[PDB]
Design a protein around this ligand. Structure first.
Ligand SMILES: *Cc1cc2c(cc1C)nc1c(=O)[nH]c(=O)nc-1n2C[C@H](O)[C@H](O)[C@H](O)COP(=O)(O)OP(=O)(O)OC[C@H]1O[C@@H](n2cnc3c(N)ncnc32)[C@H](O)[C@@H]1O
Ligand SMILES: *[C@@H]1O[C@H](CO)[C@@H](O[C@@H]2O[C@H](CO)[C@@H](O[C@@H]3O[C@H](CO)[C@@H](O)[C@H](O)[C@H]3NC(C)=O)[C@H](O)[C@H]2NC(C)=O)[C@H](O)[C@H]1NC(C)=O
Ligand SMILES: *[C@@H]1O[C@H](CO)[C@@H](O)[C@H](O)[C@H]1NC(C)=O
Ligand SMILES: [Zn+2]
Length: 475
């Protein structure tokens, strides 16, 4: 291997293609989109990353940084075969200084990070629920979770980073240094630079968090009336201190989330909306706990402390959508689709998450679409669509040939009713069926032009590009 020879000469560890190491790190989380990298480097330092980049340049291949490997399109591989992969999960050091600023290496995962922040000063950060998700991909695309309505996206806490550029140079980025690249890293997704270290501000772990679940027993009509009510409430009422998402599947619709406060105050907040939503619902979960407690409430069987021994996989097709307030027609269309178009074969299953993303009191929406590369600050809603194949080891049908039409149709029920400029998707919940041109518009909407200009400046040759990433286009 020409690249492996170069890596060896630079004293950078790499995986031989016919090795157990390769079979582990070279196999994508989503087996439906598993790719074969040209090579896999395992940097242990910023200098290692720079040396690895130089090797990829010499080889003439695109280079893809892999953080936690949880992207639905396997972008840690470049979203296709043939890229030099930089497996960063051996670089996960977390260090909190005297100013409560946390320096997190680019290969750190959410669980390990949360544990370290708690151990080093009882600190916390706003991020997703899954412990295996890499901090790198998470923050570059946003970073959404049960703390977003109260504390914003993970990227809203980023204040700096040490990165390696497409020409292998090493520089520091912040609001006062290479600020244009700093802006792009906060929401621009992949392809701008390889981050060796992220620098985050943090908040003290809250004294109390009350987790909850509301279970509904709604028919078709009650789904529409309930969602319409929830929409008005999300837009104008839902408190800054409260987060909520609806777990939707073929036979249920439940509300769940965290409250930065006690159960007494939470019941008084939920009571009014449960009534306005048409009743036919009840609180099925209500527990006061702490930061560590809430984190451990949404692991879904995953190990909390994960670093470089990771070999978990699934076989699925996901999709997403962001949107403003919806018309009754849109909601009706979505509900009808659930009731009449969601039948799947045994061994296959689906679920949807309806996230209370924006809204009057959402900390996320308190930030301008111009302040960071994140371009959905004006969107009330965020959705995650998930189509799973449970018995993929025996049967993947309709995949890989088809099956996409199911969730694409589910998205369309709502998207078709939206003005073109308000149609969007969330890069962290990627839709692999998208072309590079379609993806850029949906994922970055109004900030696409600025991002393409920044991309042209820092990576004109598109060395770090993936199949749907921001293209380099000078202004
Ligand atoms: C699998 C999964 C994903 C997920 C989740 C739960 C599971 C089980 N829960 C999420 C949640 O609650 N909220 C949210 O916003 N996202 C959630 N996700 C979605 C998605 O997987 C993550 O948000 C994130 O994008 C994954 O990051 P990860 O780091 O694991 O991904 P990757 O495939 O290796 O790379 C993703 C992309 O960004 C780049 N990247 C990653 N690290 C770096 C560094 N250090 N420097 C530069 N670029 C980096 C990749 O190159 C690629 O473009
Ligand atoms: C989550 O899992 C991690 C392993 O995947 C654990 O990380 C280990 O933390 C140990 C300290 O808590 C480290 O021990 C240190 O090792 C160095 C050299 O290896 C010694 O010089 C230090 O003396 C020693 N620390 C002590 C006891 O003074 C391990 O090196 C480290 N392992 C790895 C591979 O990172 C996390 O601890 C674990 N999280 C928790 C605490 O639950
Ligand atoms: C959904 O199912 C109905 C029948 O229940 C069918 O007529 C329709 O074509 C399917 N897809 C659409 C357009 O929603
Ligand atoms: Zn190969």
């Amino acid at each position: 291997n020409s690249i492996n020879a170069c890596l060896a000469a630079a004293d950078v560890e790499f995986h031989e293609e016919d090795s157990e190491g390769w079979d582990m790190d070279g196999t994508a989380f989503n087996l439906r989109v598993d790719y074969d990298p040209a090579a896999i480097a395992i940097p242990r330092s910023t200098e290692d990353i720079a040396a690895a980049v130089q090797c990829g340049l010499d080889a003439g291949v695109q280079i893809s940084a892999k953080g936690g490997g949880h992207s639905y399109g396997s972008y840690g591989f470049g979203g296709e075969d043939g890229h030099l992969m930089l497996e960063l999960d051996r670089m996960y050091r977390v260090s909190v200084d005297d100013n409560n600023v946390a320096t997190i290496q680019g290969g750190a995962r959410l669980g390990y990070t949360a544990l370290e922040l708690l151990d080093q000063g009882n600190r916390a950060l706003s991020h997703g629920t899954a412990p295996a998700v890499g901090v790198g991909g998470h923050v570059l695309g946003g970073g959404y979770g049960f703390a977003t309505h109260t504390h914003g996206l993970t990227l809203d806490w980023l204040i700096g980073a040490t990165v390696v550029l497409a020409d292998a140079s090493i520089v520091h980025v912040s609001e006062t240094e290479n600020a244009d690249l700093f802006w792009a890293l906060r929401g621009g997704g992949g392809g701008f630079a390889i981050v060796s270290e992220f620098e985050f501000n943090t908040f003290e772990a809250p004294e109390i968090i009350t987790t909850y679940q509301v279970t509904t027993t709604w028919n078709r009509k009650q789904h529409v009336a309930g969602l319409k009510a929830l929409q008005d409430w999300a837009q104008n009422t839902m408190p800054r201190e409260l987060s909520m998402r609806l777990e939707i599947n073929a036979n249920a619709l439940n509300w769940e989330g965290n409250f930065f406060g006690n159960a007494k105050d939470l019941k008084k907040i939920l009571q009014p909306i449960m009534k306005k939503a048409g009743g036919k619902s009840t609180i099925s979960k209500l527990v006061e706990t702490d930061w560590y407690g809430q984190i451990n409430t949404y692991l879904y069987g995953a190990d909390l402390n994960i670093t470089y021994n990771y070999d978990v996989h699934e076989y699925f097709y996901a999709n997403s959508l962001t949107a403003p307030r919806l018309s009754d027609e849109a909601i009706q269309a979505f509900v009808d689709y659930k009731f009449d178009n969601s039948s799947v074969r045994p061994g296959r299953g689906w679920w949807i998450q309806w996230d209370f993303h924006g809204g009057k009191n959402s900390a996320l929406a308190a930030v301008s679409n111009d302040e960071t590369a994140y371009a959905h600050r004006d969107q009330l809603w965020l959705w995650q669509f998930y189509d799973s194949i449970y018995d993929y080891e025996n049967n993947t049908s309709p995949y890989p040939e088809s099956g996409f039409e199911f969730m694409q149709g589910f998205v369309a029920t709502i998207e078709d009713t939206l003005p073109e400029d308000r149609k969007g998707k969330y890069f962290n919940y990627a839709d692999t069926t998208l072309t590079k041109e379609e993806a850029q518009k949906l994922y970055w909407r109004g900030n696409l032009e600025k991002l393409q200009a920044i991309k042209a400046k820092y990576d004109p040759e598109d060395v770090f590009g993936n199949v749907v990433s921001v293209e380099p286009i000078a202004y």
